[PDB]
């Protein structure tokens, strides 16, 4: 996309991660599995929910009847009424078509942005204790147990703690 | 051969497609419809008030009392008027119903 993460440097998506839209997949000595990041998932949910409502509910109409009846000696104002009805039809069709075209692009970029930013929050924590092996994965230069995993996701990874071990494994 | 941690996103059996400004038939995991293309095929009660059905008659015949529309039980209120494309029992004695279109717009509700 624009941010180049979805269908970009992260090739595909995970049918296994069912907790949310964005998350992690880890494996270490004591197991493996998926886990969604709810902080970014909820923000996207709260944001997309507000976006659909803003398109639906900023449309408010009043009671009106479109049916006007004109006899055979009123063809002029009957064609005028047709020009009004056909005029509103052309506008509301072009607006709705272009709106859904444009905002579908924006929404797919918004999900691309969230994956990119979620990736940078992890990269800027594991500065050189982990290896950017590409494909949106990090290989740690140290043993990272399930306690350590839950801290990278939480955003509280202790760099000075594991910097000692990762220095020597880099060789 | 060390520990790893990957960042990723969702995917499912979804077959819905949307159109974007750059690409058509874009498959997405979730979507919603903004366009209503379904109807129940029944003339219902608008504003909780049932409409007025004229059957074989039109408004001219109903308001003047054509002998075919005497069976039309006239209620005290209605939301809109219903005619049929085959309703032709109006002015049985030929002539000109003056301001007929305006009277319809007055009796519409």
């Amino acid at each position: 996309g624009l941010f180049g993460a979805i269908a970009g440097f992260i090739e595909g998506g995970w049918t296994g991660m069912v907790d949310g839209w964005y998350g992690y997949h880890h494996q270490n000595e004591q197991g493996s599995g998926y886990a969604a990041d709810l902080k970014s998932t909820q923000n996207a949910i709260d944001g997309i929910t507000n976006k659909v409502n803003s398109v639906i509910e900023k449309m408010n109409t009043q009671f009106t009847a479109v049916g006007k009846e004109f006899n055979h000696l009123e063809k002029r104002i009957e064609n005028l009424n047709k020009k009004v009805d056909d005029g509103f039809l052309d506008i509301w069709t072009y607006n709705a078509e272009l709106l859904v075209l444009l905002e579908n692009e924006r929404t797919l970029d918004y999900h691309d942005s969230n994956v990119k930013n979620l990736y940078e929050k992890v990269r800027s924590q594991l500065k050189n204790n982990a290896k950017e092996i590409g494909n949106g994965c990090f290989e740690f230069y140290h043993k990272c147990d399930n306690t350590c995993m839950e801290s990278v996701k939480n955003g509280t990874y202790d760099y000075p703690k594991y910097s000692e071990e990762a220095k020597l494994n880099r060789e | 051969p060390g520990d790893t941690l990957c960042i990723g996103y969702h995917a499912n059996n979804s077959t819905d497609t949307v159109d974007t400004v750059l690409e058509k038939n874009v498959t997405v995991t979730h979507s919603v419809n903004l366009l209503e293309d379904k109807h129940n095929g029944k003339l219902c009660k608008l504003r909780g008030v049932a409409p007025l059905h004229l059957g074989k008659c039109n408004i001219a015949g109903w308001i003047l009392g054509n002998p075919e529309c005497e069976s039309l039980s006239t209620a005290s209120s209605w939301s809109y008027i219903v005619e049929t494309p085959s309703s032709d029992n109006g002015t049985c004695y030929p002539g000109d119903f003056i301001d007929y279109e305006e009277l319809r717009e007055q009796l519409s509700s």
Partner: antibody
Amino acid sequence: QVQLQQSGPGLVKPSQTLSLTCAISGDSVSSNSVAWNWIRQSPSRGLEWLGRTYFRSKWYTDYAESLKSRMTINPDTSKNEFSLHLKSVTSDDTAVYYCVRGIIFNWPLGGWSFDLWGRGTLVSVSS
Amino acid sequence: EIVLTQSPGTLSLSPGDSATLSCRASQSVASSYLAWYQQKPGQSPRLLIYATINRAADIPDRFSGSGSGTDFALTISRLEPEDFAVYYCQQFDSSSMYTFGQGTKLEITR
């Protein structure tokens, strides 16, 4: 529409493996967009979620870290059911067990909620 | 990890009165992943509200959910006799996946 039928021994010798099964009607155990869970209810420990199973071209399982060792959930596609297996049972495990379905990611949006709850099988363990 | 603490334990209230049941968490809770459940006497639990604001299927208008972050609530506007039951809140995180509350009892009495 959708119904859940539970069955299993109501009494367990307090050392053996607790076993319970849950047959599904109307929905599919190997269905996506849903997830099948086990939850117990003991007057001492409230409502405890135990584990879940879901199929996404592959069978997954997630267990509560409180047990994480003695529980297993096996599916069976030929009968469209899924069962529970709680090994090394103690008197802490005496509770009412429910099988229950998860329905996340429907409109209005997201949110893991339990909507279909089984009738409930009370399993006492006693010597 | 995330502990849900409801209050009050028991709630004495006459039929027709308006009830508010609260549910406070030890940490922040994802608004969408919070839900409410009703357990009528002798029957199994039953989904009442999901996504913190959305009534479940076949749920009367009396029930409405609220809250965000740490504190949530469940308000019943007019108590029917069939509302004598126990109500549980439930949340989801990626560490302690499914956690409930101890449940409020709606003791319809005086």
